């Protein structure tokens, strides 16, 4: 039985980042599918109660998004703890938090990524402007969809590094890429039919352009660290190449979120996909 | 004052690691000289405390080498306790304890570093033999233990089942540690102050090795090792995210050199955590 199987786990929701109402949705949704399972779960609010108290649990199913659940503090101490887990480890999320770390894993590791620059006010706008090209988008660095702007002049710049430097003293500039952008979501460490991004399947792509696109976010996947389950962004360029954006190692788990649409697309209910998950810890 | 300013604090020392008798050393001279300068200072062993106890203390020096407290897992538990603490936050340490990832983002940051493969057991080394060229050096990715190919690969699945093979050069090897986010006077090794350099190539290795710790996401103190070819090229090698405080240890030196006593250091890394 279940009960048995899992022992008491900890659906950790909820946090201390700009995203803890998504994180409480999601652990809600996450903590019913559980218990509709038969698993033991009880939420857990590391905002509320102390991280310390995790020791109650023979495991975690982590659905904190954003500052201290994807970054690898959480990871951290349920590392030092010892209590297993779900998706991606300490080093993994750390690095999957950052958007420019993530892209030098990917450089290092001969995968295909925009290039980019780093812009910190003593940077140069026209040494940018003439390396990258324009048009280029404008992201802070480590909220891992929001103060993304889109920069086609010299003008369009002084705005858009001002959306993103409310979320981040560190920005980046990337060369935009004429295309669409599909996500390719994880588990059991594997790809599960792509997405588009603006309902996106199908997606726009012949059955081979998906499969090379699935191998190649495997790479990404494994490349950055990343384990068990997870979403990677990726644009497709109207020459047909393929550009990795991102690595995302706490996805949603809400009504409208894109891991539970994917999974669906191969059988799994959302209860289905949750036991899944939460199989890693075993 | 100083038993006001930084309040209780407790000296992150000893653990369950491999170099835990190393970090006992460091730990007893740390808190020997913070106590020494006034600050109320207690060591704090894991292995003999409960975790709960740390929301006791106001802030923390961390001098636990090794898993635990060079990999992002104690600066995890204290980011979520809220407790302030010395070094490189949860992922410096993470990437910093992995030569790999290390030298993965140093390459994607254009900072010279010695090619390399990954090589572990179900690989043929003709591959890496005829890419990177004898003679090579051996080492376990998530930590000595090293070497200089069928029975070296197994000296290091015993620390690590991943080991990285890396283009051996001929030259000098330094290490540049840093305090305040700044660097410090370098130091030669195999004493090593002066280095045999000329002021012009130190400030030089500096830079440069300031943005290695940078782009690294290390902060406050720690050590970057490099190398010099015999052409005057620096390789980076490594990051030290919990150097050494022991009396044998390079970072003391460094800081010597440049005007602070041993307590004097202690206190300026504890000044990070205001």
């Known amino acids: 039985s279940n009960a048995t199987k899992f022992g008491k786990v900890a659906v950790l929701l909820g946090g201390k980042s700009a995203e ?78 950052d958007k420019v770390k993530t892209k030098q894993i990917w450089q290092g590791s001969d995968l295909p990524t925009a290039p980019y620059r780093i812009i910190t006010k003593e940077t140069d706008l026209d040494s940018v402007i003439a390396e990258l090209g324009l048009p280029v988008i404008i992201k802070p660095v480590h909220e891992g969809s929001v ?60 059955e081979t352009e998906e499969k090379k696109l699935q191998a190649l976010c495997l790479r990404a996947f494994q490349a950055v660290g990343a384990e068990g389950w997870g979403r990677i962004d990726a644009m497709q360029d109207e020459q047909g190449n393929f550009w990795l954006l991102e690595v995302n190692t706490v996805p949603g788990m809400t009504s409208h979120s894109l891991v539970p649409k994917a999974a669906k697309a191969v059988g799994y209910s959302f209860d289905e996909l949750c036991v899944a998950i939460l199989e890693q810890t075993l």
């Open 147 to 206: 103060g993304m702007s889109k920069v086609e002049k010299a003008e369009d710049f002084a705005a858009a590094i001002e959306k993103a430097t409310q979320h981040d003293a560190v920005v980046m500039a990337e060369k935009w890429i004429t295309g669409r952008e599909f996500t390719i979501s994880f588990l059991n460490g594997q790809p599960l039919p792509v997405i588009r991004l603006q309902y996106g399947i199908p997606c726009g792509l012949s």
């Open 20 to 97: 803890r109402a998504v994180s409480l949705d999601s652990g809600q949704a996450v903590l019913d599918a559980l218990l509709r399972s038969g698993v033991q779960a009880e939420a857990f609010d590391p905002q509320d109660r102390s991280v310390t108290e995790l020791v109650n649990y023979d495991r975690a199913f982590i659905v904190l998004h954003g500052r201290g659940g994807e970054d690898g503090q959480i990871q951290g101490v349920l590392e030092w703890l010892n209590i297993p887990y779900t998706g991606t480890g300490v080093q993994g999320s750390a690095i999957g938090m």
